[PDB]
Design a protein around this ligand. Sequence first.
Ligand SMILES: CCCCCCCCCCCCO[C@@H]1O[C@H](CO)[C@@H](O[C@H]2O[C@H](CO)[C@@H](O)[C@H](O)[C@H]2O)[C@H](O)[C@H]1O
Ligand SMILES: CCCCCCCCCCCCO[C@@H]1O[C@H](CO)[C@@H](O[C@H]2O[C@H](CO)[C@@H](O)[C@H](O)[C@H]2O)[C@H](O)[C@H]1O
Ligand SMILES: CCCCCCCCCCCCO[C@@H]1O[C@H](CO)[C@@H](O[C@H]2O[C@H](CO)[C@@H](O)[C@H](O)[C@H]2O)[C@H](O)[C@H]1O
Ligand SMILES: *C(=O)CCCCCCCCCCCCC
Lengths: 63, 108, 155, 67, 84, 170, 171, 547, 119, 79
Amino acid sequence: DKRFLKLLRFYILLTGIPVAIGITLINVFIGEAELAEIPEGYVPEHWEYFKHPISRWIARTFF
Amino acid sequence: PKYEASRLSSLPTTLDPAEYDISSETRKAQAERLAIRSRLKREYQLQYYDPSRRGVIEDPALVRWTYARSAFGIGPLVFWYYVFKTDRDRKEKLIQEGKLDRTFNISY
Amino acid sequence: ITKDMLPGPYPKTPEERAAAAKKYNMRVEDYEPYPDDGTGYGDYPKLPDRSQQERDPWYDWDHPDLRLNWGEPMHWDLDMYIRNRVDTSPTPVNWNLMCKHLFGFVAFMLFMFWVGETYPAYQPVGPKQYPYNNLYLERGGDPNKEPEPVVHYEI
Amino acid sequence: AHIEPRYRQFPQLTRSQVIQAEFFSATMWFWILWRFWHDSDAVLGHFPYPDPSQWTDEELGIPPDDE
Amino acid sequence: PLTLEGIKDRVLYVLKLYDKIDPEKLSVNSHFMKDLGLDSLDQVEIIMAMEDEFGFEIPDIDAEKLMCPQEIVDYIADKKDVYE
Amino acid sequence: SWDKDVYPEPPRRTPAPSPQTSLPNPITYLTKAFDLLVDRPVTLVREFIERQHAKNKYYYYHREFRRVPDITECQEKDVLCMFEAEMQWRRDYKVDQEIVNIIQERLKACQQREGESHRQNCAKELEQFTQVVKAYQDRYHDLGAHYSARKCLAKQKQRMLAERKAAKEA
Amino acid sequence: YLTHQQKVLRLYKRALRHLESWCIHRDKYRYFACLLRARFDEHKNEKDMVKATQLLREAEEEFWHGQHPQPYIFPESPGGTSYERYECYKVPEWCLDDWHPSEKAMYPDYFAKREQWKKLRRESWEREVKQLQEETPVGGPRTEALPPARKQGDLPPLWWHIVTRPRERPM
Amino acid sequence: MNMFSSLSLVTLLLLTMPIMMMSFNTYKPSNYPLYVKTAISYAFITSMIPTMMFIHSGQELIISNWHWLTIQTLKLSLSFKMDYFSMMFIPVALFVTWSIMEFSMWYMYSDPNINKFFKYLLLFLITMLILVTANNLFQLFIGWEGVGIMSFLLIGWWYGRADANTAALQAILYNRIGDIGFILAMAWFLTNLNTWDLQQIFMLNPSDSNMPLIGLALAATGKSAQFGLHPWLPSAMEGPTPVSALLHSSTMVVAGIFLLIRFYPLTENNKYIQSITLCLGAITTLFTAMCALTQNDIKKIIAFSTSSQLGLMMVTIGINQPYLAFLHICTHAFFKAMLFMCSGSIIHSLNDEQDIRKMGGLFKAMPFTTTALIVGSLALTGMPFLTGFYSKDLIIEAANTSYTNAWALLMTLIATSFTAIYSTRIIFFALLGQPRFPTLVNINENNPLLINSIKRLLIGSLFAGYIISNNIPPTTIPQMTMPYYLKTTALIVTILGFILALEISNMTKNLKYHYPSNAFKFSTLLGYFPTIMHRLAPYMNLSMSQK
Amino acid sequence: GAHLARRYLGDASVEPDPLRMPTFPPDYGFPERKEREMVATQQEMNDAQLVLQQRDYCAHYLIRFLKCKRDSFPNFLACKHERHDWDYCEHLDYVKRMKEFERERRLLQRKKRREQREA
Amino acid sequence: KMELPDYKQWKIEGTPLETVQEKLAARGLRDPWGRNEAWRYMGGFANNVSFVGALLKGFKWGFAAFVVAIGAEYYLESQ
Ligand SMILES: CCCCCCCCCCCCO[C@@H]1O[C@H](CO)[C@@H](O[C@H]2O[C@H](CO)[C@@H](O)[C@H](O)[C@H]2O)[C@H](O)[C@H]1O
Ligand SMILES: CCCCCCCCCCCCO[C@@H]1O[C@H](CO)[C@@H](O[C@H]2O[C@H](CO)[C@@H](O)[C@H](O)[C@H]2O)[C@H](O)[C@H]1O
Ligand SMILES: CCCCCCCCCCCCO[C@@H]1O[C@H](CO)[C@@H](O[C@H]2O[C@H](CO)[C@@H](O)[C@H](O)[C@H]2O)[C@H](O)[C@H]1O
Ligand SMILES: *C(=O)CCCCCCCCCCCCC
C-alpha cells in the first residue's frame, strides 16, 4: 500500500512540478494580454480573442 | 401480565411451557440435532485446521442459500399517474388563466 | 457442488422429503418446506423467523458476527435478520402495550398543542406602536403612493 | 507511572490536582457572588411592575357611567 | 497488567472474605464441594464474586466447571492473556 | 478595473474615529502590523511582477459579431439562412443570460451593502431586476431543451395575438 | 438441553444480577440478596420433581415481571458498551506470511520463532488427524468435545487456532 | 477590510493545511495529533481578529472569491458570509475543538489509528465551518452533508463492533430523511426566486414561504434530532467519547438550529412556521428530558440532555428570538463539551465503565473532574451568572411573556425542572455515596493534557456567557418588564427540580423493595419509539424489497 | 396571568382581544390627546442601520448607546448608563401598552354596564 | 509485585453493613459476603459529602475572596 502511494506521488509530481513551475514562469514574465479595441482595418487571428498566454497557445496550436 | 409474543418480539425461552415439558422423545431429538451439528463441525474443522490449505472453505449451505435467493404490482403506477396527472392538470389550467405566480421563475 | 446438493422443486412424495431434509443437513422431523404456492421457494426449508441476535452469543460459532455455523441451513431471510438489521428479541414490555402507550402519548400531545393554539398565552398589553405611519417607507412601501396615516397618542 | 494503583484503598492524589480543583471551585463561587452583588436585578427584576387595578379612571380616560 | 501470582492472590483473597469458608482449609487446590463442603448455590455466588473482583463476566456454561481456586486462576489467566 | 456604470457603487462614507476611551485600540496596532508585515512585502512582489509585464505588452480583443437577418426573414426550410439566424439567436440568448446575471449581482450587492436598511434602500435594484426577469421570461421561458429561434418566434406570435385580442376586448 | 439443576442455578445468578441493578447500593443489595437466597433455600430439598418444576416455572414468570428494563451489563459482555470494540484490531496470524521480506527483516528473532511453530504445526497434523479417526465412532462424533493428547510428544488435536488466536487487546 | 477578509480566509485555509500535508510533505507522524492541535490553536487566534473588528464597528463582509459554475441565469460562486453568526460561532467552535483535541491526545493515546482519528476530527471541523460560513444553499449543502458523512465515519470508529456500524448507519438514515426537506427548500427557492444565494432570497422576501420553510424545518428536525427523527443522537454514543463531545457541542447537532437561524428573515414573517417550530421544540425538550431521568449510561444521559437543550433552541426559534437561540448555541457548547470530557475522565479511570450504577464515591477521588462536573451541571441548570444563565434565563423570560402556545410554554417549563433532576442524578450516582466499582483502583486524573483541556472549558463555562453577552450588539428589544412570578420562573422550577430530585435519589438508599411502574418503563425504554420503529419500519421495507 | 383566566374561563365580552384592540376611538373619554413625539428622524435610523423592530419611539436612546459602545472599544463595560437609558425608555413604552390594555378593559366593562342599564 | 492489604482489616462493624446484618438476624438469616464489601465503607471512602456539601465546594474560599473584593471596592468608593 505504501509503495503504490509513493509511486502515485512520484508520477503526479514528475510532470506536476515542471507544469507548476512552467505556469508560474509564464504568468510572471509573459503575463496576460491586455484588452484593446480592434484597430480600424485590422483583422485579429482567432487566437487573439483570448487573454491568457496558454489559452492563446492552445487555440493557435490545436483548435 | 402474561407475556404476549409478536412477530417482532419472540416469547422468552424461560417463559415457554415446552422448555420444561421434556420427554425421552424430546431428548432424543436434541441428541440427533447435536449429532448433526457435531458432524458438520468436525468436517469444517478438518479443513479449517489443515496447515496446507489456502483458500476458501466453500459452504454448500451458503451456496444453497444464494442459489435459492437469486432464482400492488401496477396499482402504485396507476395511483401515481393520477396524482401527477391531477396535479399537472390543475397547474396547467392556472397558468393559462394567469392565476399561477411565476414572477421570478426563469429556471427550469 | 452438484445439482443433487442444490435446491430443488417443491417435494411431493415423502421420499423427496427425506432426501430434501438430508440435503439441508436437517432431520426429517424438522424439515418443512414453504407452502407450495407460487412464490418460488422450492424445497428450501422454512426455519423459525428469528433474528440472529437471539442466538447464544457465548457459543463458538464458525461465524461469530453472523452467529452461524458452517454447513447449518441459513434462514431464507438471513440478510434481513443479521444483527445490524431486524431484531426480534423478547422485550420486557409486551409489544401491544408498547404501541398503545406510545400512540397514546403522541395523540395526547397533538391534542394539547391544538388546545394551546386555540387559547394562547399573552401579556395584558396593547399592540406595539411604531412611528412614521407604521414605518411605511422602511417596510418597502411605495413612496409615490401616499399612505393613509396611522396616529399614536400619549397615555 | 507517577501514581501506583491501590487495592481496596482510596487512591493516591497529587498536590497539584487538589489545589487546582479547589481554586476553580472557589473561583466559581466568587464569580457568582460578585455578579449577584452587582447584577441582582438580572435575577429579581429590572423595573417595578405596575398594579393596573390601582390606576385611576381619569388617567385612563374612562368616562363616568352616566355621561 | 495482571500476573499469575497477582491473580492467585486476589482469587484467594476473595475466598478468605467468604464466611462459609474456613481460611485454614483454603489452598489453591481446595475443591469447593468435596473439600470445603459448599453448595452449588454457594459456588454460583463465588463465581459472581470473581466476576465483580475482576470486572468481566464468566458465562454460565464455563462457570459451572470452576470448582477449585486454581481452576478460577487458570480461567482468568487464559481469558486475559496472562502468561507469567 | 471594471466599468463603474455597469457595476455601480454609491460613494463610501466611513466615519472618522472618535475614541472616548483611554485603552489603546488593538485593531489599530494590528492594522499597522498588517501593513508592515503582510501588505508591504506583498506590494513589493507585485511591483516586481508588473515590471516584467510592462516589458512585454501584447493585446487581445473582444470578438464583434456582425448582425445577420433574423429567423423572421428566413424562407421556410432554407437551412443556409436559418443556420445564420439560428446561430445569432443562440448568441443573443447567451448574452441575455449574462444580462440577467449582471442585474442579479447588482441586487445582491445592494442587499449586503445596505445592511439592515436594505428593504428600503434597494428598491431601484429590485425594480430593475423585476423588469428584466419579466422580459427574459417572455423571450425564453417554456421553450424546452430543444429550443430554437423558430420556437421562440412561435411563442412571440402567440403572445402578440393574445395582446391584439385583448386590445380589441378593451 | 439443560438439566433442571442448571436451570435453577442460571435463574439464581440472573435473578441476583437484576436485583443488583435495582438496589444499586451494596448494603441494600446485600440485604435483599440474602432474602433471595432464603427463598431458594426454602425449596432446596423438594423431592417431588413435578412440584420442583412448577416452582421453577413460577420463579421464571415472577422474574419476567420483576426484571430490570435496563440491567447492568459488564462492558465486554455481549450487549455491553465495549463488546467487540477491539475486533477491528485483531489481525489473523496468517497475514504475516504475506509481509514483504524487508518488513520481515525488522523482526528477525520473532519470525525465526514463528518458523518453529509452523514446523511444529506441520509435523503434528498427521498424528492429530489419525487420533481423531481412531477415537471417533462410526457415523461421526455425537458431541463437539475434543480429546487431549494421549501420548508424550503428541499435541491435542486441532490446537492451532486456539493457541495462536489474537490477544484480547492486540494493540 | 483587507485585513478583515485576509484573516477570515486564513482561518479556514490554516485548518486544511494539516490535511494537505498528509500527502508526504514534511509530515511528522511522530506527533501528528499535536500538529493538528496546534493548527486549531492558531486558527482560533487568527479568527479572534475579525471577531474583534466586528465587535468594534459591526463590520461584515461577503467574500465571493471564486466563480465555479454558471447555469444560465444562476451563478454559483464560492462565497463566504463573514457576518454576526459566523464571527461569533467560529471562535467558539475553535476554542472548544482546541480543548477536545487536547483531551483526545490523552484519551485516544493507545489507539493505533490516533493519526487517522485526528484527521477525521479535523475534517469534521472543516466541513462544519463550510456550513456556517456558506452564503449560498449549494455551498451550505456541501457542509450539511459533509458533517453527516464525518459523523458516520466517527460514530462507526470501532468498525469491528456491529452496534457501532448500526448506530453509524442509523445516523445517516435519519439525517438523510431531513435532507429531503433541505432539497425541497433548494428546489423551491430556485423555481420561485431564481437563486440559491441568501442575499437574493432575503431581498425578494417571499410571502408564501410555507413550503420552503417546512422543508427547512424538516432538515433541522433530522440534523438537530427533534422529535420524530431523534433516536439517532442517543445511539451516536457508540463513537469514542471525543466524538460525542464534538458532535454534541460545536458540530452536527446545532447545524439544524443554525440553518433556521440563518433564515430568520423569512421565519420572522411566517407565524404558521413559528407555531410548528415552537410545538416541535416543546415536545422534543420535554420528551428527551424525560428519557434522561431513567438512563443509567452516563453518555446516554448527556446525549438526551443535548436533545433536550436542542429542543429549547427550537422553541426559541418558534417564539421569534433567533438571536437568543444563537446565543444558547454558543453558551451550550462550552459546558456540554466539558460534561462529556468529565464523563470520559470518569470512564477512563474506571476501565471503560459507563454505567452510573457502578460509579459512586468519586467526589474526593477525582477532585478536578468533580469540580468541572459540578460547574458544568450548574451551568446547564441555569445557575445565575454562569455561562448557561446568560441564554437560558433570557429564553424563559422571552417565552413567558410572548404571545405563544400555552401548552408549549408549559412543556418547556417542566423540561427545565427535569434538567435539574437528571443533572442531580449524574452527580448523586457518580460522585456521592460509596464506591461501587471494582477493587483494583486505577483512578488517576493527573495528566496535563486532561487537566488543561478541561480547565479551558471550565473557564469558558464560567465567563464565556458574560463576556459574549456584553460584546454582541443588540438586534432586538429585550423584554425586561414582567411580574415577579414570570421573572423568576426559571430559577424556581430549577430549584424545585433539585429539591424533588434529592428526595427521590435519597429514597434509593432505603431498605425497601422497588417495583417498576408503567411510567418508569416508558422513560427507561425511551418511550418505546426505537423499539417499535427500528423493528417495524426495517421489517416492512426489507420484507417488501425481496419480493 | 390572571387576565387569561377571565377571558377563557369567565366572560370574554369584557376582556380585550389582543389582536383586535384598540376597539374604541383614541379620543373617546380623552379631551385633546397629544401625539407621541419621535425624536430620531427616519434618516438617522436609516443611517444608523437600526433593525426595523428597534425603530420605535425609543430609537434615539439606542442610537446614543450604539455610538458609545463603538467609541469605547475595547472597553466592553463603558456604556452602562446609556444602556440603562434605553432600557428604561422601553420600560416606559411597555407600561403605555399596559395602560392601553387596561383602558380598553374598563371601557368594555363600561359598555357592558350600559347595555344592562339600557335593558 | 503488588502487596495486598491484610484481609483481616475488613470488618462490617461500624458500617451500614452492620445494620443489614442486624435486620437479617431478626429473620434468622445471615450475610456471608459482608466482609467482601467492607472496604467500600472504610478508610478514605468512609465519609463522603452530601449533595449540598458537593454543591458548596469552594464556597468558603470563594466567599472569603468575595468579601475582600467588595471591601476593596467599597473603600475606593469613599476615595
Ligand atoms: C503548463 C504547460 C503548458 C505549455 C504550453 C504553453 C506554453 C506556450 C507559451 C506561449 C505564450 C506566448 O504568448 C505570446 O507572447 C508574445 C509576447 O510578445 C506575444 O507577441 C506578439 O504580440 C506582440 C505584438 O504582436 C509582440 O509581443 C510581438 O511582436 C508578437 O510576437 C504573442 O501575441 C503571444 O501569443
Ligand atoms: C490535450 C493534449 C492533446 C495532445 C495533442 C497531440 C499533438 C497534436 C499536434 C498537432 C499539431 C498541429 O499543428 C499544425 O501546425 C501549427 C501548430 O503546430 C498549426 O497551424 C497554426 O500554427 C502556426 C504556428 O506558427 C501558425 O502559423 C498559424 O497559427 C497556423 O499555421 C496547426 O495546428 C497545424 O497546422
Ligand atoms: C406532559 C404530560 C404527559 C402525559 C401523557 C399522558 C398520555 C400518554 C399515556 C396514555 C396511556 C393510555 O393507555 C391506554 O389504556 C391502558 C393503559 O392506560 C392500556 O391497556 C392496559 O393498560 C394497563 C396495563 O396493562 C391496564 O391496567 C389496563 O387495564 C389496560 O387497559 C392501553 O394499551 C392503552 O391504550
Ligand atoms: C400570564 O401572565 C401569562 C403567562 C403564564 C403562562 C401559563 C402556563 C401554562 C398554561 C397551561 C394550560 C394548558 C392549556 C393549553
